[PDB]
Each structure stands twice: as structure tokens, then as C-alpha cells.
Design a protein around this ligand. Structure first.
Ligand SMILES: CCCCCCCCCCCCCCCCCCCCCCCCCC(=O)N[C@@H](CO[C@H]1O[C@H](CO)[C@H](OCc2ccc(C(F)(F)F)cc2)[C@H](O)[C@H]1O)[C@H](O)[C@H](O)CCCCCCCCCCCCCC
Ligand SMILES: *[C@@H]1O[C@H](CO[C@@H]2O[C@@H](C)[C@@H](O)[C@@H](O)[C@@H]2O)[C@@H](O[C@@H]2O[C@H](CO)[C@@H](O[C@@H]3O[C@H](CO)[C@@H](O)[C@H](O)[C@@H]3O)[C@H](O)[C@H]2NC(C)=O)[C@H](O)[C@H]1NC(C)=O
Ligand SMILES: *[C@@H]1O[C@H](CO)[C@@H](O[C@@H]2O[C@H](CO)[C@@H](O)[C@H](O)[C@H]2NC(C)=O)[C@H](O)[C@H]1NC(C)=O
Ligand SMILES: *[C@@H]1O[C@H](CO)[C@@H](O)[C@H](O)[C@H]1NC(C)=O
Ligand code: NA
Lengths: 274, 97, 240, 201
């Protein structure tokens, strides 16, 4: 029920001149927006990406970002000159802005900034501040960014007002797409493990949504505690892939099944016998 | 960090039937990476890449995928060139794994 | 409060020579800037610095080298001066805020040759008895003549203190020989005071011309006196 | 070509009159806009600074407005005095920090013609302190309507008209000098001078 909205930005600076900035947006585990360096405008990846904003409201908002992207590039370039020769290219900056949605009219907006893959700066209250672990040289950049009263007021409005308003629209507009149910398909296989006389049975599960799923190897009605399931790997069509592995002895795969429960199945659990 | 590669099929693998092959590259920085999907060592043209992103730990990930018909003879792989590694790493698809 | 100083305020140079415009600042401002002003254009940024050691290229950096030896000083160095660098150069400073506190300005003239450079002859003309009787006012007239180039600052001093009230100076010097190319200039200025102030014989009136020309370093091949940056003046007491 | 354009390029107004200076820009973004005042051979005196979307400012006789939507700014000058004779520059800063660059306009040359109350035209002869052989002719105390012209003889030198301001007495008067190597009666021949000009002797 608690959906998290994320606006991920990735900025690469190779030298003084060359730089590119790319962005994506996620509502839960669904991409809502894309914005390539090539493109001058933000691309919708869903039909409901505009949400409950009018066309005029979106244009004002898009232009705001269009200005930011140009200004961000130059600011960073100038901040490097300011610190130099303390820090130098190549540089990779990452932003992770967004707002978690809680039931009622409750939310928590955030704007996290990372420098060379290390979370260093955030926007908190009405100003930029560093976090524990951040170098001390960042203090001058922070001092400069906090001097810009206009940027502060704009970001405050963006986090406090715009983010929760906008996302509340998305959840309504893309309700059916968020609450969609897709059935997993399963199939079995085996490979030799590190051990000499040991097999490793694998239970594949693919094409299910949402992410929550239950997969276990079973002997009759006895849970095999050896079962080790891997990571949730994505599919192209916005569904999930998962495999569960169980280490066994060779010639001891008789009466071993893989049970799979999922919300979309609705009672009728999948069972595949070896 | 050295990039973790994982190859897997969308649908159950059966000889003859068309299918989609996925290649999920994760846990790498900087984000400048060159991903290739191979068929018997040869470069497959027209490979669809997902938009690049990152996780809570600021580590980049990307999903490459392409259509394929898995035969008994043919081998499929995913080759990754990255600054972290010296020689490009190649992970082969195993229908069993 | 946040003041900025530039030196020199006025400079004459020849093509090929070295020119060093300096800019001192005691505000502890990290950031300093260099602009130039040209009639028809706005102020354009040449170089700027974010701190001691740092120097960065502006919009029009070509022909200039910057130098930030300390927080206070920030110098603009013309290694090989050219006529195209004839301009008014402004220096500025500022902290992290957007405000840039500008200096008073620096005029630079880059001549082709220094052969025709000459300081002025200053004459002070006393007011007429006709004027005093008619208007009950006394107009002194100053006259700088036969000087080149036209980089002069004329000022009036009464009892060793500069007067601004009741002063009028010509906006642009007129040429003595308009026909000739490198013509010497002339400049007039006027100081009007009350008759009783002029009639007071304890008031010392003086017109001073600050001529800018050659320096000690500049070589001189001609036989006449070296036309260096100097002051020429004329004086007169009051009389009843 | 430039990102900041001002209008008019120049203008002439009589003392007491008002005048409006324009400033259009294409700078993006536009954090603030500042109006400077540059007297002849002087520095940059700041008049005001505007920051809001629809901002209004004042500084006694000076007042200004700004519309960021239109990217337009005006500078009103109520009751122009002689000292307002200056170049008025328009500046736009694209940030609210030291990261920003300043985009300058070419400026607007204002010329205020002074209001002479009581004219009393005359041409006096002055004498040099050092040697009394030399002299100059001082045409003075004429209203702004009178225009002085260059001499017929090139050997004779005549300056353009210029105004001074005795601030203690609140008094203004035009004046012009003439000299050669020549009498004051013959000095300002090639010039439409008033008929009631006092030539003393
Ligand atoms: C974020 C949540 C949005 C949710 C809703 C929409 C979602 C829809 C999807 C969107 C897709 C795009 C996703 C992209 C996600 C990544 C970006 C997230 C963070 C966005 C930050 C927004 C910043 C916008 C402001 C900006 O452009 N600043 C620009 C431009 O600012 C200028 O122009 C503005 C125009 O708005 C203002 O003028 C208007 C104005 C003047 C005066 C006033 C006032 F109040 F005085 F009267 C008011 C206004 C401002 O006053 C002016 O200075 C400024 O240059 C910023 O410094 C850019 C950089 C900011 C990020 C810094 C991150 C920290 C980096 C630290 C790393 C240091 C390392 C160094 C080696
Ligand atoms: C927007 O909301 C923030 C608070 O919200 C928090 O920060 C956001 C950036 C998001 O991350 C939210 O998820 C998060 O809940 C408001 O910040 C607060 O502003 C007030 C009033 O300006 C601050 O009060 C001041 O406190 C100082 C001492 O610390 C006093 O000296 C001042 O006199 C004054 O009382 C307060 O510090 C600040 N809160 C925090 C936690 O920093 C912000 O005002 C608001 N802005 C708008 C435009 O709505
Ligand atoms: C990323 O985008 C920026 C902004 O669009 C590109 O910068 C422009 O590049 C074009 C041609 O490549 C130039 O004509 C412009 O002068 C640049 N404008 C600005 C504001 O920088 C940049 O080249 C892009 N980078 C990559 C690698 O694609
Ligand atoms: C800047 O970096 C890019 C990308 O690595 C490179 O192609 C380019 O040659 C570099 N340019 C300069 C001037 O160093
Ligand atoms: Na200029």
C-alpha cells in the first residue's frame, strides 16, 4: 500500500567540456518517466505519467526541470574550478529525489545527493547540509548553494507541495496498472555443484507481478530447509524472475516437488514434480 | 566493484520455440559500460537495452535483452567490457542453470 | 563598506610593451573578477579567480593573463599590449553571494609609438573687474595646451583642498591642429566663486593637471625632456 | 546578438521633466536585475535591484519595475536634475550566488539640459597671472537656447558650451572660452548670440 516515488538522476563529467546527464523515475517498481541527454523534453513511459496535472501545469513543471539541467551542469563545472586542485574530473554525481506515500494525507519527501558513489549531501528543512561521513571541503559548495535563496524556496515547494500532490494523482491515474496481477510460469532443471557426488536442482519462476512470491522445494508435505532462493531478476515486459536452488545427492531426486504460491494464482498453487 | 552478470530466459526453454533472452548487469561503477549479447561468439544486432538506473547503494544496473530460438547446438552468452576489469568477462547461458 | 581599489587608475603604453593592472581588496572576498568596457558594448568578463592560486578564463580571455598571488591582490597582465586593448578595465570582488562590488575603473591607451608624447603647459586666467561689478561673481579660467595623448585629469584646489562646487571642465579636449594626424590637444576649465571670496587675499587658487605619459622604464631617443607622468599647475592669490 | 538590450540608446530631456528607460533581456534563468549609474569617467553606482517575479522598487526620485514573464524592466526618473546626466546600465544575474554570470547591457546615455532662470549674456576678457600679454574671452551667462559654434579661423580656438553649479548659492550658468595668437568683440562672430550681450570696455 505504501508506494515510494523516486526521481533518479545520473550525471557524468569526464573533463571541463564533455558531460551528460540522464534521468529515470519510478513509482514502486514501474518506470513512469525517462529523460535522455539527447532529448530536450521528458518522455512518458506510461499512459498515466502526466497524472492528474493539466497540460499547462506540466509545461511549467517541465520548463522548471529544463532550466535546472542546464544550470546544474554549469554549477558543478564551476564548483570544480572553485575547489581545484582539491578535486578533479572524472566526476559522477547522482541525485535521488522523491517522496514516500503513507495512508491519509501523510508523506515524507527527500532529496539525497551522492558524489563518486558516496551519499554526501541532502536537502533538509530550508537548506543543503552534509551528512556524517562527508568530506569537509564540501562545506564551501554547501555555503554557496545555501546563498541561493531562490533555489531553496523552489526546492522547498517541490518537496513539500508538488511531490505528494503529483504522486497522489499518479496512484489514481495508474491504479489498474499498479494493481495488475500476472501468473508465474515454472520449470525444473539440474546441474552438478562443487561437491563430487552432489546435484543442484533449480526451480525457475518467471512472469509474475507484484514482487511478493513464495517458492520452496518440498518432499511430500515437508519443507526442505536447504532451499536457497536468489535475487529478484527483472524481465523486459515489467515482470519478475526468480530461481530457488536446493543441493541434493545424486539418485535422490525421487518425490521432490517445487511449490509456488502467488496472489495472481489465487488458491491454485503451482506444483512441479521431478 | 566488478560487474555481476546473470543470464536467463523469459519463458521455459524449448528447442524450436521462439523466446526472449535476458542479460542483467549489476553492481558496477562508473556507469560507462559496453554490453553485448553473443550467438556462437558472434555479435547479435538490434539488442534492446533498458534505461540505466541505480539501487539504494548507488550501484548501477541495466537490463539487455533480445529474441532467440534456443537449439541444441547453438550457444548464447553476454559479454561485458568495464574499466574495473582488465579483460572483458563472458557469462554463457545454461538452460539447466 | 566593501571597498575595492585599482592601480594604476590611468595608463599610457606602447605596442609590444608589458602592462600590469592590479586590484587590491581587503574584504577577505574569495572571488575576484576582471571586466573591460567599450562604447557600444557592455562590460565583458576577461578572467576571474575563486581564490589564491586559481585563475579562470572568461568570455574574452585572449590577449590577457591573470594572476592571483593572494586573497587581496588580483592582477591582469597584458604580456604583449596592442591598440585593440585600449579600453576601461573594471575589477570586482564578492563572497558566496551574487553581489559583485566593483572598483573605480582603469583607463588604458595603447599607442603605436611614443614619439609625439608631450606634457601640457598650464595657464591660469584671473577674473575680469567687469564681471565682478556686473554679476558679483568671479570666474577663473584654466588652460592646458599642447599635450598628447589626451589622458589628463584637470582639478581645482583652493587652500590645498579640492573644490567641486562651481566647477566646469570640457567633456572632450579639442585638437590644436585638426589637419595633422598625431595632433596635440587643448583643455579648458572654469571655477566660478563669489566676488568677496576672490577679493579675499588669503585664498590661494590653483588649477592642477595630472598628465599621464611615459614611465622610468620607457626608453627615450629624442633630445627634448622625457614626457613622463607628471603634474603641471598654475596658481594665483586673491586681491581686492 | 546580445542577451540584454536597452532602449532608448540615448535621449535628451529638460530639467524637471520625467523619463523612462527600458531593458529587455533573453537571459535564462533570471535571478535578479540591477540598474547602475555611470557618470562621465566614473564607476558604477547601483540604483536598485529587483528579485521577485513582479517586483517594484524605489530610491527617492529613482523607481523601477520588473516582469520576469515578459523579461522586461523599466527605470522611471521623476524630476530630472543636472547630475542625472549619465549612462544608465542594465545588468541581469542568472544565479543567486557567486556561481552566476552577469550579463551587461550597452547602456542608455541620458543628457539633462539645465533650467537657467535669469540669463545675463556677456563676453569678458581674462588675463594670465604669469604674463599679462596672453588672454582669453569668456562668453558666459546665456540660456540653453543659445548654441556656440566652432571658430571660422582655425588659429582661433573656441570650446563647446558647458554648465557649472554653485551648490551653496543654488546657481547654474552656461559658459564657453575662446583664445588665439584677436579681440572679444570678434571672438564669437560665427555664433548666433543674443542681441543684448554685454561687451564691456
Ligand atoms: C524533485 C521532486 C519532483 C516531483 C514532481 C515532479 C516529478 C516529475 C518527473 C520529473 C522528471 C525529472 C527528474 C529529475 C530528478 C532530478 C532532479 C531533482 C532535484 C531538482 C532540484 C530543483 C532545483 C530547481 C532550481 C534550479 O533550477 N536551480 C538552479 C538555477 O537557479 C537559478 O534559477 C532558478 C529558476 O527557478 C532560481 O531563480 C528564480 C527565483 C529567483 C528568486 C526567487 C526568490 F525567492 F528570491 F524570490 C525565487 C525564484 C534561482 O534563484 C536561480 O539561482 C541552480 O543553479 C542550482 O544550484 C542547480 C543545482 C541544484 C542541485 C545541487 C545539488 C547539490 C550538488 C552538490 C555537489 C557538490 C560537488 C562539487 C564538486
Ligand atoms: C517545507 O517543509 C520543511 C520541513 O519538512 C522537512 O524537510 C523537507 C525538506 C522534507 O524533507 C520533509 O519531508 C521534511 O519533513 C520546512 O522546514 C522547517 O521550516 C521552519 C520554518 O522556516 C524552520 O523553523 C526554523 O527553525 C530555526 C531553528 O532550527 C529557527 O531559528 C527559525 O526561527 C525557525 O523557527 C524549521 O527549522 C524547518 N524544519 C526542519 C526540520 O528543518 C519548510 O519551512 C517547508 N517550506 C515550505 C515552503 O513549505
Ligand atoms: C548532453 O546534452 C548537452 C545539452 O544539450 C550537450 O551540450 C550541447 O552540445 C551541442 C552539440 O553536441 C552544442 O552545440 C551545444 O553548445 C551544447 N550546449 C550546452 C548547453 O552544453 C552535450 O553535448 C550532450 N552530451 C553528450 C555526450 O551527448
Ligand atoms: C573529454 O572526455 C571525452 C569522453 O571520455 C573524450 O572523448 C574527449 O576526448 C575528452 N576531451 C578533452 C578535451 O579532454
Ligand atoms: Na566590452
Amino acid at each position: 500500500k505504501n508506494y515510494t516515488f523516486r526521481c533518479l538522476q545520473m550525471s557524468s563529467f569526464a573533463n571541463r567540456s564533455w558531460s551528460r546527464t540522464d534521468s529515470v523515475v519510478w513509482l514502486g517498481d514501474l518506470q513512469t518517466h525517462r529523460w535522455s541527454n539527447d532529448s530536450a523534453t521528458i518522455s512518458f513511459t506510461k499512459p498515466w505519467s502526466q497524472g492528474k496535472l493539466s497540460n499547462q501545469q506540466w509545461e511549467k513543471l517541465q520548463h522548471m526541470f529544463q532550466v535546472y539541467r542546464v544550470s546544474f551542469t554549469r554549477d558543478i563545472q564551476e564548483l570544480v574550478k572553485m575547489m581545484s586542485p582539491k578535486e578533479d574530473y572524472p566526476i559522477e554525481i547522482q541525485l535521488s529525489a522523491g517522496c514516500e506515500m503513507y495512508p491519509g494525507n501523510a508523506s515524507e519527501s527527500f532529496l539525497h545527493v551522492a558524489f563518486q558513489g558516496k551519499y554526501v549531501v541532502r536537502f533538509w528543512g530550508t537548506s543543503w547540509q552534509t551528512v556524517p561521513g562527508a568530506p569537509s571541503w564540501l562545506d564551501l559548495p554547501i555555503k554557496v548553494l545555501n546563498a541561493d535563496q531562490g533555489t531553496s524556496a523552489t526546492v522547498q515547494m517541490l518537496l513539500n507541495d508538488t511531490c505528494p500532490l503529483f504522486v497522489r494523482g499518479l496512484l489514481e491515474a495508474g491504479k489498474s496498472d499498479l494493481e495488475k496481477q500476472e501468473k508465474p510460469v515454472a520449470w525444473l532443471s539440474s546441474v552438478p555443484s562443487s561437491a563430487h557426488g552432489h546435484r543442484q536442482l533449480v526451480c525457475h519462476v518467471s512472469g509474475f507481478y507484484p514482487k511478493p512470491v513464495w517458492v520452496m522445494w518440498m518432499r511430500g508435505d515437508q519443507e526442505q530447509q536447504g532451499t536457497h532462493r536468489g535475487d529478484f531478476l527483472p524481465n523486459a515486459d515489467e515482470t519478475w524472475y526468480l530461481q530457488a536452488t536446493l543441493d541434493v545427492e545424486a539418485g535422490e531426486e525421487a518425490g521432490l516437488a517445487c511449490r509456488v504460491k502467488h496472489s495472481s494464482l489465487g488458491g491454485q498453487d503451482i506444483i512441479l514434480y521431478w | 566493484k566488478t560487474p555481476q552478470i546473470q543470464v536467463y530466459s523469459r519463458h521455459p526453454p524449448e528447442n524450436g520455440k521462439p523466446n526472449i533472452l535476458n542479460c542483467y548487469v549489476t553492481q558496477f561503477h562508473p556507469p560507462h559500460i559496453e554490453i553485448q549479447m553473443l550467438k556462437n561468439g558472434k555479435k547479435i544486432p538490434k539488442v534492446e537495452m533498458s534505461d540505466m538506473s541505480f539501487s539504494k547503494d548507488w550501484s548501477f544496473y541495466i537490463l539487455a535483452h533480445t529474441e532467440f530460438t534456443p537449439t541444441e547446438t547453438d550457444t548464447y552468452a553476454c559479454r561485458v567490457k568495464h574499466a574495473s576489469m582488465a579483460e572483458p568477462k563472458t557469462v554463457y547461458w545454461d538452460r539447466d542453470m | 563598506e566593501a571597498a575595492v581599489t585599482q592601480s594604476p587608475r590611468n595608463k599610457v603604453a606602447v605596442t609590444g610593451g608589458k602592462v600590469t593592472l592590479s586590484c587590491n581588496q581587503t574584504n577577505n572576498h574569495n572571488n575576484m573578477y576582471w571586466y573591460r568596457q567599450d562604447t557600444g558594448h557592455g562590460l565583458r568578463l576577461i578572467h576571474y579567480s575563486y581564490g589564491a592560486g586559481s585563475t579562470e578564463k572568461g568570455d574574452i580571455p585572449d590577449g590577457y593573463k591573470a594572476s592571483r598571488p593572494s586573497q587581496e591582490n588580483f592582477s591582469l597582465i597584458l604580456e604583449l599590449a596592442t591598440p585593440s586593448q585600449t579600453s576601461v578595465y573594471f575589477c570586482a570582488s564578492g563572497d558566496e553571494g551574487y553581489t559583485q562590488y566593483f572598483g573605480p575603473g582603469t583607463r588604458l591607451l595603447v599607442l603605436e609609438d611614443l614619439r609625439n608624447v608631450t606634457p601640457p603647459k598650464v595657464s591660469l586666467f584671473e577674473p575680469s573687474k567687469a564681471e565682478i561689478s556686473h554679476t558679483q561673481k568671479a570666474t577663473l579660467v584654466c588652460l592646458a595646451t599642447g599635450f598628447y595623448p589626451d589622458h589628463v585629469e584637470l582639478s581645482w584646489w583652493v587652500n590645498g583642498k579640492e573644490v567641486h562646487s562651481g566647477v566646469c571642465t570640457d567633456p572632450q579636449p579639442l585638437k590644436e591642429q585638426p589637419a595633422l594626424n598625431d595632433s596635440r590637444y587643448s583643455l579648458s576649465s572654469r571655477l566660478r566663486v563669489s566676488a568677496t571670496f576672490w577679493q579675499n587675499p588669503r585664498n590661494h587658487f590653483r588649477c592642477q593637471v595630472q598628465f599621464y605619459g611615459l614611465s622610468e622604464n620607457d626608453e627615450w631617443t629624442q633630445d627634448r625632456a622625457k614626457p613622463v607622468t607628471q603634474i603641471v599647475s598654475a596658481e594665483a592669490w586673491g586681491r581686492a | 546578438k546580445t542577451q540584454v538590450e536597452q532602449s532608448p540608446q540615448s535621449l535628451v530631456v529638460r530639467q524637471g521633466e520625467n523619463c523612462v528607460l527600458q531593458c529587455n533581456y533573453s537571459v535564462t534563468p533570471d535571478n535578479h536585475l540591477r540598474w547602475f549609474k555611470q557618470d562621465t569617467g566614473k564607476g558604477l553606482v547601483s540604483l536598485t535591484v529587483l528579485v521577485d517575479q513582479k517586483d517594484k522598487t524605489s530610491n527617492g526620485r529613482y523607481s523601477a519595475t520588473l516582469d520576469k514573464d515578459a523579461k522586461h524592466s523599466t527605470l522611471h526618473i521623476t524630476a530630472t536634475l543636472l547630475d542625472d546626466t549619465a549612462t544608465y546600465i542594465c545588468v541581469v544575474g542568472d544565479r543567486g550566488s557567486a556561481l552566476g554570470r552577469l550579463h551587461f547591457g550597452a547602456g542608455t546615455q541620458l543628457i539633462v539640459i539645465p533650467d537657467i532662470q535669469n540669463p545675463d549674456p556677456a563676453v569678458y576678457q581674462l588675463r594670465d597671472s604669469k604674463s599679462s600679454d596672453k588672454s582669453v574671452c569668456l562668453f558666459t551667462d546665456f540660456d540653453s537656447q543659445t548654441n556656440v559654434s566652432q571658430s571660422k579661423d582655425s588659429d582661433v580656438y573656441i570650446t563647446d558650451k558647458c554648465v557649472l553649479d554653485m551648490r551653496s548659492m543654488d546657481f547654474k550658468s552656461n559658459s564657453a572660452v575662446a583664445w588665439s595668437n584677436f579681440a572679444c568683440a570678434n571672438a564669437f562672430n560665427n555664433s548666433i548670440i543674443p542681441e543684448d550681450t554685454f561687451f564691456p570696455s
